[PDB]
Every structure is written in structure tokens, then in C-alpha cells.
Amino acid sequence: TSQVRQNYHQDSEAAINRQINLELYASYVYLSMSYYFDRDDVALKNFAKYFLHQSHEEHEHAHKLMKLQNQRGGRIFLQDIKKPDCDDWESGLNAMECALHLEKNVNQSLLELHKLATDKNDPHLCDFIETHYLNEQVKAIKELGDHVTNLRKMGAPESGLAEYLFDKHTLG
Amino acid sequence: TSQVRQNYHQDSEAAINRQINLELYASYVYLSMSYYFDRDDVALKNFAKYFLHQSHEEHEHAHKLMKLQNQRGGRIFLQDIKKPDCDDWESGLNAMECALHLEKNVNQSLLELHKLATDKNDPHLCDFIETHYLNEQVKAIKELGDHVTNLRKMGAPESGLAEYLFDKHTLG
Amino acid sequence: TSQVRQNYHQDSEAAINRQINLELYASYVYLSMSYYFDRDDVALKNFAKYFLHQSHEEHEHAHKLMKLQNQRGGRIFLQDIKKPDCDDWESGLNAMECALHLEKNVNQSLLELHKLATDKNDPHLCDFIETHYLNEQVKAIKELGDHVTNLRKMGAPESGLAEYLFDKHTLG
Amino acid sequence: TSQVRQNYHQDSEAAINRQINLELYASYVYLSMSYYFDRDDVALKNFAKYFLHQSHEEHEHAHKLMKLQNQRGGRIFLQDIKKPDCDDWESGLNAMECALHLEKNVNQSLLELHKLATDKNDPHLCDFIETHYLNEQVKAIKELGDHVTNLRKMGAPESGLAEYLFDKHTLG
Amino acid sequence: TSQVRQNYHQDSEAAINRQINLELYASYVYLSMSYYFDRDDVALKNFAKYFLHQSHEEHEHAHKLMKLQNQRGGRIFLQDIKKPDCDDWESGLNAMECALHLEKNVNQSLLELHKLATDKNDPHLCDFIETHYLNEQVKAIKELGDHVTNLRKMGAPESGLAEYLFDKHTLG
Amino acid sequence: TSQVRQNYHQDSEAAINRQINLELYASYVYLSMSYYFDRDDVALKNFAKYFLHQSHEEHEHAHKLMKLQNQRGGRIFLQDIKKPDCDDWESGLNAMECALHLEKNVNQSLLELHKLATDKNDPHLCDFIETHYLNEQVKAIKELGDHVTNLRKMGAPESGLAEYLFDKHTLG
Ligand SMILES: [Cu+2]
Ligand SMILES: [Cu+2]
Ligand SMILES: [Cu+2]
Ligand SMILES: [Cu+2]
Ligand SMILES: [Cu+2]
Ligand SMILES: [Cu+2]
Ligand SMILES: [Cu+2]
Ligand SMILES: [Cu+2]
Ligand SMILES: [Cu+2]
Ligand SMILES: [Cu+2]
Ligand SMILES: [Cu+2]
Ligand SMILES: [Cu+2]
């Protein structure tokens, strides 16, 4: 056992490792989206920039989780980072919807992690999740919902002008 | 009677209190509109910012009226601030129309207050109303009329792109 | 249902709306106190400034609650803002005591809200309440208790000199 | 009862007082260590500086706890600050190990305090402990574990050169 | 024996250790006073600040004594830091009187230490005591006497206004 | 076919995709190493910093490759990012040796890619590889060889002092 380990259950360690893998997968999905919008036949530069920024944020989240795993005396168990489900995201609106679904999945995983930590009486882990992840997820979900609503109201995905103007004005 | 009271009729005091309540109600209505446009299924951020600014201005107007009530030796009688008539404003254009109607109602109340003050030979009250409220109301009504005209000409409320572009270019 | 809603119970939404109304009522009470101390026959300017600042803070609290209501996919239901219980607060000390009672009532409402959120397993709501409201309420209650103790020890409300000197030195 | 006291159980107050005493004792232990390393026959200046800084931090923790005790309407009950268990710490590595043990004991006491506060439904106390103490304890334990690991790997306590170089490079 | 020890009698070392314990006890007493005046039912913030500053100064004095103990080749023998005699100090004036008594006790201990050092022909110790402690004690005693005289003349402890105004004007 | 595609063979596109996957895998391996050295029982902070920087550089390389894939009209085909071969790297020296082996493998893959591009008469791809990857790989291999040589000469992995001093002086 680690010399620093204290009130850190094995189930919590395993859940943290699974969350690390999930964050890495989310970063990979966002990277795929970003370079989809960099394609010559899509050419939505600010969509690509937005999704690249999201990928970097997901990477940072994974980094913070690994840092905690080391801090609490747990051991990081890395797994394969699965390829994203889709290679073509078909539009800016569809990509935004997929991002919203992914963020809600990550939020659900974090909520289950918080429930596990509460069941294990690990207040430090609960506070870490609340401070660094829960409100970030809520804000991200709200932002993606706003983007999806605006894109739908502007006439996307049928109206290419809608996605162009959203790219310029909202994501620009 | 107040030691500072001079040429301040009771009817004027009551009308000032009613105007204070009306300004508070207008602030509350604008707050409702602003947080309506902050909703995920509406997501018009600059509309929300505009209506929040209007709410703050209405609050300032109420503050100035209470300050006068104290200055003239009257006593402030606060009443319930009624909830806004609507919780869903259905569009940016409809919200702008409702704001125009509210501002015209406030203007009519101020005109009646000025008429009462003139009938009571209270030149200080008349000058206060003229200096701080009448031209502000005229400018606000003109601005809201311009916004409504522009939104109607752009194709709102049917065209969501119209309200999006108005949000970005005019209110942004 | 809102596209962003996740782990947000209806009871939590209703409690948030009630808390919004309570914060608005507290702001209104503080406004009443502030303009009571601006009266010519009271003339305690820093008491008025203090209570006006408290009113603005309460308004900000209400704003934050409405922002969360939108963030979590809930819908803001506004109610009538009831008039304050008293129009004459009879002294600086009595106003401070009433403010202390109001702050403790708000604190109790927030504690009940936190208990409800815990019962509903909504860690984001619990963390929001803890981060933004609980310690603020504790600090406000402590400050008001200090003010009340100092005013009582100085000889208020019988000693007008006591309230004058407290107005100058503590609230000034 | 205190005029500011609200949702503050007596058991929580007693536990807070015990935690205050524990923090003072930890500060005293760190002071003893620091001036042990200032001895002419030990002469590890940066070890002394490190332990003096730790003592000051422990003092600050005790200060924050007393501040909360006053804020919540509890009454501070001070006890004797027991002398440290050891007067000679025998090495830098042994002192680091003792510091790690002390920090883990403090962490366990804080976890028990958090459990008590949770059992008493005192969310403000729980949030205070999480915000100001839990992560600080985790970081301190991790840092001390790193120091102990490095000292052991360098060949301490047998190798005086190891402790000298650690004093210069890590603690310097 | 220490390699640096020269003309340092054992009795002097023991007296230095006793003085270290006395300084720590004085710091603890001042801390108790400071957080007594931070209570909601006392609420004299500048009294608390003054006594906290005194506690920090006492800590610094203890630090200097331990530094000398190491410098002269003596060994620091730490003892239990006894709890302060009183938990409730009943007023600002009573706290000031207790502080004056404590400072005079510390001064008497330092004078006995100087007499012992003179009897042992240890001029370095005598000069240390004269340079760093004797005049500091005289100044502290004079300041506390001035505070006590002013508080008594203003009408304390019966007049709460007296202690309030002293808190603002002298300690502020 | 892409409207921008010109002199871009399918085999080159597939090789570019494989190189993208290899760069992502290298970044993942470096991340694993970095957080291995952040462990409490390893505690080599500058080793962790070095490997984290290497991971970020590998990520940047992957980014540049994807950018080229889009520029030349190819389509990015992402694959699973395999978990690193090892979870425990057993020392700084062993980690450096593994990094050297990985960099040489990446260099061999890049050389095969350049050979393929030459066989396909794609001078732009050849120049891209030469400008951005070949000399970077040579420099990285040289640096890792220098690190390995220095660690071996200092007595690693048996001498923990060797790895500590290398961590401080070379990687610090
Ligand atoms: Cu994330
Ligand atoms: Cu995310
Ligand atoms: Cu108005
Ligand atoms: Cu208006
Ligand atoms: Cu509030
Ligand atoms: Cu409040
Ligand atoms: Cu501590
Ligand atoms: Cu500690
Ligand atoms: Cu002293
Ligand atoms: Cu002293
Ligand atoms: Cu590379
Ligand atoms: Cu490389």
C-alpha cells in the first residue's frame, strides 16, 4: 500500500481510472470533430477551433484526474483509448448535438463517481469532483444546448448560410 | 408633519408612491424578460443583457423617486410588487413589443403625475419629472419602436435567423 | 423537458423558485430600511448606505439563483414580491435586529434547500449552495450580531449619541 | 445561547475545540523539529526553514478554526498544548517520517470531524472542512511522502551526503 | 558537550528554557484574549487585532530565545504550554489589566534571568537580554499602563461607549 | 475525390493515418511515464515534467500530420490508441531507454513514410517530412542517448542518488 494512502477505497480508485479513460476518449472525439471541420469540403474554421479547444480542456480534465490518483496513493491504470464512434459528423449542428450527448454522458459518469465517493465516505474525493468537474459539466452542457438551439432556430442543417453565420458570429 | 415639507401636497405624495411601485414592477418585468432570453431553448444572450440593463435602469428610477419622496418630506409607502403578466414572452419581437407597451404605460403615468403636480402648483416636482423622467421615457420609447420596426422588417418572429442577426448586430 | 436537464428534480426546481422569491423579498426589505434611514427625521446616512448595499447584495443572490435555474434546465416561476412587514423601523438598533432575523430566516431556508438537494442526490446543487450562499449567510449573520452587540453596549436605542457615533465610526 | 448560533450542534463545537488543540500541538511539534535542525551538531538550515514554515501554517490553521468557532456562535475552549513526543528527531529522514505520521493523524481527525458534521446535517461546517483543510492535508501528505521517498532512495539516514544534498536541492 | 559551547552555564540554559516556555504561554494568553474580543457578544475588533499582534510578538520573542539556545550550544527542552488562566476576560479594561500583569511577570522573569547571567559572568547573555527584551518589556508595560489609565478615565468597564470609542480611536 | 487533391496517392494517405496513430500512441506512452514519475514512491518531479513535455510535443506532431492530411485532400481515419506496453517503468534510466526505443521506432516509421512518398513522386510530402519530422527525431534521439549515457555513468539505476542528482541538474 502507498505511504500516503488514507481513506481511499479501491472502488474509488477503479472509478477514477475509468473516468480518466472517459476523459481521454472525449478529448479524442473532440479532436476528430475539430479536424472534420478543417476539411476542404466542410471549411468551418471556428467550429474546428471550438472543438480543438474542447479537446484540450478534456485533456486537462484527464490530467487533473491522474494528478489526484497519484495524490491519494492510487495507481493509474491506463486503457485503450477507443476511436470515436463517427468519422463524419455531417454538419455543425449534428456535431454540436453529439458533443452535447457526450458531455451529458460524462456528467452522468461524474455523478455516479460522486455517489460512489459519498457511499465510501471520502469527502476529499467528493469535494474534488464538485469543485473541478460538476459545475464545469453543467456550464458546458448549457453552452452546447444554447449552440444547438441557436443553430436549429437559424435553419441548420439545411441552411448552409445559417451554419456559416453561426461560425462567424457565435464561434468567431 | 415633516420639518422640511413645503408646498408638497398629499395627492402628490400618493402619486409618487404609486409611481415608485410602477417603476419597481417595470424592473421586475424586465428581469423576467432577461432571464427568459437566458433560457437554453431561447439562448439570445444580448437580448437578455439588454433587458437586464433595462431592469437596472428601472431600479435606478425607483431609487430617484424614493430619494425625492424623502427630500420633500413625504413618507415612502411601499406596496407588493406584482409578478409580471407573462412568464413566456414567445420571441424577441414579442418581448420588445411588450417592453414598448410597458414604457408607454409608464410614460402615461408620468404625464398624469406631471399634470397633478401642475394642478397643485408644485414647480419643483414638475421640474424633477421633466428633467429626469420625461425625456428618458421618450428616448426609451423611440429606441423600442426602432427595435420593433427592425425586427418586423427582418422577418421576425417567423425567421429565427432574423432574431439571431438582430441579437448580434443591434443588441451586441 | 429541457435538453440540458440532468439530475434536476422538480422539488429542487420549486425550492429554487421559492428561494428566488425570498431573496427578492429580502432585497425589498433592505431597500425599505435604507430609505427609512434617509428620512429627514432619522438622518443616519451610513445606515442607509449599509442597508442599500445589503439590498444590492440580495439582488445579486437572486440573480445567481435565476442563473442556476436556467443552467440546470429548470424554469423560473416568479411570484409577487411582498411588501416589507414594517414601514417604520424605529431605530438603527431595531433595524439591525430585524436584519439579523431576516438573515437567519434566509439561512434556514438555504439549509432546508441543501437538505432537499442532498435527499435528491444532486451534488451540483449542494455544492452551489455551499460555495455561494452558506458561508455568505454565516458571515452576514456574524456581522449583524456584532453590530447589534455594539449598539446595545453603546446605549442604543435610548442614546441617540450612541447611534450617531456608531453610524460615523462603524458604518462610516 | 449566542445570537448568531444556527444549526451548530454542541458535539460539533467540542470537536472543533479538539481540532484547534490538535493544530496547536502540530505547530508546536514542527517548531521543535525546526529548532532541532538549527542545532550546531545537526546544521541543516533548509530543514529548519521547512519545519518552521510548517509550524506557521499549522498556526494559521488553528487561527481559521478559532475564527469559525466565533463565527458559528460557539465558544473557544483552550486546553494545554502538550509538549512534542520527541526532543531529538535523529535525522532529516526520521523527522520527515514523523511529520508524515502527524499529518496523517491530523487528516484522520479532520475526516472524523467531517463525518460528525455530516451526521449533524451541518453543511456549512462540512464545506469549510472540505474547502480549507482536506485538500491541504492531502497535498501535505503527498509532499511529505515524496520527501521521504527521495531521502530513502538517496541513502539516508546512513549517508550524511544524501541529507546534505537533499537539504540544498529540494528544501533549498 | 557542544563544540560551540563557551562560558554557558547549565543554570543559564535551564533559565532560558523556562523563559521560552513563559513566552509561549504569554503568546497563548494573548491569543485567547484576541479571540475573546472576536466573539459576537463582545465584538471589539481592534482589541482582538491588538492582542493578536501581542501574541505574534510573544511568539517572536520565544523564537529569538530558542535561536540563542542553539547559538550558545545549549539544548532546547520544551514543556507543556499551559492553558490561559481565564477563558472570559469580562471587558477590554480587564483584559488590558491582565495583559499588564502578565507583562510585569515576564519582566520580573527576565530580570531574574539577567541577575543569574550576571552571577555566572556571562556578558553575552546579559547583553542579549538588555538589547532584545528589557526595553521592549518596559515599553510594553508603559503602553499597557497608558491604555488602562485611559480606559479607566473614560468610564470603563461600566460605560460600553467608553470601550467602543477607545477601540476606534486608540486601538484603531 | 477532394477538390484540392493533387499528386496525393492513396498509399501515402494510409501511411499518414498510420503515422498519426503512432504519434498519438507515443504521446500516450510519454503521459504514462510522466505520471509514473509523479508517484509518491518514485517522486522525480523533473522526470515527470520532461515526459509530460514530450507527450505534448508528440500531440503537436499528430496535429501537424492531421493538418497535412486535410491540406492534401486526404481523409483522416482515426484508430484506437493502444495502451502503453508498461505501467511501471522501474526507474528513470529504464524510462529513458524506453523513450529512446520509442523515438527510434517513430524515426523508422517516418523513414519508411519518406521512402513511400519518394516512390510515389510526392515532393511536397517528402519536404514536409524532412522539414518537420526528420531532424526533430534525430535531435530527440541524440538527447535521449545523452541522457541514457549520463545516467549509466552516474551509476543508475542502482544509485538512487544518481537519478536524484540527474533529475535536479540535467532535467531541472
Ligand atoms: Cu471533461
Ligand atoms: Cu467535457
Ligand atoms: Cu422608469
Ligand atoms: Cu422605463
Ligand atoms: Cu441573500
Ligand atoms: Cu442576505
Ligand atoms: Cu493543519
Ligand atoms: Cu498540517
Ligand atoms: Cu515577550
Ligand atoms: Cu510581552
Ligand atoms: Cu513525434
Ligand atoms: Cu517523438
PDB file of C-alpha atoms and ligand atoms in Angstrom, chain A residues 23 57-58 61 103 106 133 137, ligand 1:
ATOM      1  CA  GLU A  23     -11.983  11.974 -20.427  1.00  0.00           C
ATOM      2  CA  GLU A  57      -9.965  21.025 -21.981  1.00  0.00           C
ATOM      3  CA  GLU A  58     -10.816  17.310 -21.854  1.00  0.00           C
ATOM      4  CA  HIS A  61      -9.511  17.178 -17.056  1.00  0.00           C
ATOM      5  CA  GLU A 103     -20.967  15.925 -22.233  1.00  0.00           C
ATOM      6  CA  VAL A 106     -19.516  12.452 -18.923  1.00  0.00           C
ATOM      7  CA  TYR A 133     -15.925  18.846 -12.603  1.00  0.00           C
ATOM      8  CA  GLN A 137     -20.007  19.990 -16.867  1.00  0.00           C
TER       9      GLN A 137
HETATM   10 CU    CU G   1     -14.190  16.635 -19.060  1.00  0.00          CU
END
